[PDB]
Design a protein around this ligand. Structure first.
Ligand SMILES: *[C@@H]1O[C@H](CO)[C@@H](O)[C@H](O)[C@H]1NC(C)=O
Ligand SMILES: *[C@@H]1O[C@H](CO)[C@@H](O)[C@H](O)[C@H]1NC(C)=O
Ligand SMILES: *[C@@H]1O[C@H](CO)[C@@H](O)[C@H](O)[C@H]1NC(C)=O
Ligand SMILES: *[C@@H]1O[C@H](CO)[C@@H](O)[C@H](O)[C@H]1NC(C)=O
Ligand SMILES: *[C@@H]1O[C@H](CO)[C@@H](O)[C@H](O)[C@H]1NC(C)=O
Ligand SMILES: *[C@@H]1O[C@H](CO)[C@@H](O)[C@H](O)[C@H]1NC(C)=O
Ligand SMILES: *[C@@H]1O[C@H](CO)[C@@H](O)[C@H](O)[C@H]1NC(C)=O
Ligand SMILES: *[C@@H]1O[C@H](CO)[C@@H](O)[C@H](O)[C@H]1NC(C)=O
Ligand SMILES: *[C@@H]1O[C@H](CO)[C@@H](O)[C@H](O)[C@H]1NC(C)=O
Ligand SMILES: *[C@@H]1O[C@H](CO)[C@@H](O)[C@H](O)[C@H]1NC(C)=O
Lengths: 116, 320, 211
């Protein structure tokens, strides 16, 4: 036994779905991919790497991608880069930019009252 | 439904008369589960660039071999991390109580930690505010000394002493943790408290709550409908109430953990990605630098501080 | 303005507050249709159909079920109230430290070096605009911890020694702007024999060309 979850893009874009059988083995349930979260059926697993869209678990996320289908992949953690590490040289900025970012915070709720 | 009624049809039907409580219970637990991944997101994923650790672990006399990944280990954890992980289900599953996997696995968390360490050592705190700007480690320290009101010449003329004091101070960390079982009790406690909550929830199934029997099928087989309904109603109320209690406690505990995660995220930003001027925020003494380490269900910070010693009495005056 | 317009999800945190409270009230109302073991969800039907000693018992069931629904609602509101209080406390802190001053706390008032912030009003909350300084276009220079001159070790007062390739200069750390190394931009402490990585370079004395 186990839970059954439906993975889907918004219905404003597509009506395609994929079904995850949580903690279930793909040979127990009866594009079939076995993950630690259970058996994922309907999504095509690829060896590419993207930013996480609809998270499944254990490093696996699903997304609706280009013709169009639902795919599964291991999520990217960030851009791969490398930092210079010399003992006799220093990097110094010759220019700069000014950036503006936004931050949004809740302050209050709707006030209610109940006549018991 | 499984928790309360098991596979009993008569109960499953009766349960529908008590409203949407089962839906509300799922609503609350789902919200918590999602938040637990967000909490991890906020603490470790503070860098959009994943950096590779340097080929060397020894910089200007400073030995970082205890905090950087050890390539001889299959898990590629650092000596200290491996210690932290080493010190710190069917019975529950069969009752409808299951466990969901984290989105970020241990390997992924380790990669975030390595990127932060690589940045801290090779580019100081420039990678936190902007691009990673390389600097010689001894010069990074010189700036950190100026930041605490000590002229940089003090570092350069005492580089050997400082490097030695640092290296010794780090080695003592692994020994202190190894010889102090209670050191990670703070993370142990979270695990234990949640385990107890599930075990309590399961044991409550054996309670009758005033009913003739704890087993639903041992009631319908013996009692006439109008009589069984009374005994079953008691069991449903007791079991549903137990679920409500469980969820309430989980919501309260989640709030405490969220607050801790927020503090950890703040310290990452202010202790690791910069130098703090807040007293006793990044350890006792004058903060120089900090290094993150991975741990089970949490994060461990190593705080490096400057401490004055051997004072002498002098005569003074406000002016000449 | 374009960012907020093109990405509606930006204000999801404010919408979530509205949605959660709206759901809580709708759920509470729906619970009235529950029977909780009673013959009917309607109080009048129980009293009209059944005699006193039985009618009261089934009414007791409806009263208990409805009291527990109200208690559930209140408990959830108390927990959510705590979540909002914490957010409001943070918003108030940011107002004081980001808007009414300049922060030295990393990533507290946006990404990069904080210059200033501006508040904006919003439904059930506050929006901050964070203005920050970001370094760009770095270049590699050769460096040294000190300059050796006349047997003495010279350290920079507020900057770093660099080498554009052959000449030595002293500049500020956050923006390349090379200056001649003199005797009013450095300080002297100790000899040249205890500084690892020290290099030889003449330090200019602005008084001697005049004398
Ligand atoms: C649905 O998609 C259309 C574009 O075809 C877009 O204009 C509209 O805003 C979308 N609505 C929602 C709710 O996403
Ligand atoms: C699923 O079934 C296959 C085939 O028997 C087995 O090798 C694999 O370990 C199973 N996985 C789980 C989680 O049961
Ligand atoms: C990913 O690559 C491995 C080889 O390392 C291969 O066996 C596997 O089938 C590939 N999976 C996909 C979806 O391409
Ligand atoms: C700095 O960048 C700006 C563009 O934002 C450019 O116009 C300016 O010439 C650049 N200055 C230098 C020294 O590169
Ligand atoms: C760094 O310390 C380790 C012991 O923790 C030691 O084995 C290693 O040789 C040291 N590195 C250097 C360059 O001495
Ligand atoms: C400095 O003088 C005080 C008394 O005024 C004394 O208690 C203290 O121990 C002295 N410290 C040193 C280093 O002499
Ligand atoms: C600075 O040196 C590093 C390491 O060699 C190199 O990757 C980087 O591109 C260099 N930057 C410039 C402007 O030369
Ligand atoms: C470095 O600066 C000096 C200033 O005297 C100049 O003469 C020299 O050509 C510059 N070198 C380079 C590579 O720009
Ligand atoms: C910098 O590293 C090189 C090895 O790449 C070494 O030969 C040189 O002596 C080091 N410089 C200092 C000041 O330690
Ligand atoms: C500086 O000059 C001294 C002689 O006074 C010499 O011994 C030393 O090696 C020189 N250092 C450098 C970096 O040229």
């Amino acid at each position: 036994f186990g839970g059954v979850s439906v993975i889907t893009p918004g219905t404003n874009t597509s009506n395609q779905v994929a079904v995850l059988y949580q903690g279930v083995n793909c040979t127990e349930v009866p594009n079939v991919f076995q993950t630690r979260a259970g058996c994922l059926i309907g999504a095509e697993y690829v060896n590419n790497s993207y930013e996480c869209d609809i998270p499944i678990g254990a490093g696996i996320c699903a997304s609706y991608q280009t013709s169009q289908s639902i795919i599964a992949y291991t999520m990217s953690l960030g851009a791969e880069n490398s930092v210079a590490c010399s003992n006799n040289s220093i990097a110094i900025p010759t220019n700069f930019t000014i950036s503006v970012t936004t931050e949004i915070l809740p302050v209050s709720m709707t006030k209610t009252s109940v006549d018991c | 439904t499984m928790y309360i009624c098991g596979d009993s049809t008569e109960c499953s039907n009766l349960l529908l008369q008590y409203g949407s409580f089962c839906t509300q219970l799922k609503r609350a637990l789902t919200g918590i589960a999602v938040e637990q991944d967000k909490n991890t997101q906020e603490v470790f994923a503070q860098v959009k660039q994943i950096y590779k650790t340097p080929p060397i672990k020894y910089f200007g006399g400073f030995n970082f071999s205890q905090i950087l990944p050890d390539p001889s280990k299959p898990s590629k954890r650092s000596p200290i991390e491996d210690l932290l992980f080493n010190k710190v289900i069917c019975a529950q599953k069969f009752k409808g109580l299951t466990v969901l996997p984290p989105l970020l696995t241990d390997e992924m968390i380790a990669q975030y930690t390595s990127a932060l360490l690589a940045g801290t050592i090779c580019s100081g705190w420039t990678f936190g505010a902007g691009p990673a700007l390389q600097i010689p480690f001894p010069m990074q320290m010189a700036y950190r000394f100026n930041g605490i009101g000590v002229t940089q010449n003090v570092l350069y003329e005492n580089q050997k002493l400082i490097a030695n004091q640092f290296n010794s101070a780090i080695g003592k960390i692994q020994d202190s943790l190894s010889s102090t079982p209670s050191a990670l009790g703070k993370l142990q406690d979270v695990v234990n408290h949640n385990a107890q909550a599930l075990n309590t929830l399961v044991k409550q199934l054996s309670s009758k709550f005033g009913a003739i029997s704890s087993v639903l099928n041992d009631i319908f087989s013996r009692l006439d409908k109008p009589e069984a309904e009374v005994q079953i109603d008691r069991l449903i109320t007791g079991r549903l109430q137990s679920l409500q209690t469980y969820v309430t406690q989980q919501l309260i505990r989640a709030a405490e953990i969220r607050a801790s995660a927020n503090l950890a995220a703040t310290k990452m930003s202010e202790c690791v990605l910069g130098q703090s001027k807040r007293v006793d925020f990044c350890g006792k003494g004058y903060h120089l630098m900090s290094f993150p380490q991975s741990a089970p269900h949490g994060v461990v910070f190593l705080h490096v501080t400057y401490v004055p010693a051997q004072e002498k009495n002098f005569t003074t005056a406000p002016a000449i | 303005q374009d960012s907020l317009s093109s990405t509606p999800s930006a204000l999801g945190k404010l919408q979530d507050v509205v949605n959660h409270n709206a759901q809580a009230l709708n759920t509470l109302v729906k619970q009235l249709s529950s029977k909780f073991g009673a013959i009917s969800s309607v109080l009048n039907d129980i009293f009209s159909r059944l005699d006193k000693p039985e009618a009261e018992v089934q009414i007791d069931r409806l009263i208990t079920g409805r009291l527990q629904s109200l208690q559930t609602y209140v408990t959830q509101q108390l927990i959510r109230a705590a979540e909002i209080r914490a957010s409001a406390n943070l918003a108030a802190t940011k107002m004081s430290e980001c808007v009414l001053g300049q922060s030295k706390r990393v990533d507290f008032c946006g990404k990069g070096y904080h210059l200033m912030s501006f508040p904006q009003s919003a439904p059930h909350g506050v929006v901050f605009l964070h203005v920050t300084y970001v370094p760009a276009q770095e270049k590699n220079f050769t460096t040294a911890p000190a300059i050796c001159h006349d047997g003495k070790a010279h350290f920079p007062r507020e900057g770093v020694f660099v080498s554009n390739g052959t000449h030595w200069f002293v500049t500020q750390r956050n923006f390349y702007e090379p200056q001649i190394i003199t005797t009013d931009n450095t300080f002297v402490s100790g000899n040249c024999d205890v500084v690892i990585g020290i290099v030889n370079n003449t330090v200019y004395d602005p008084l001697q060309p005049e004398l």
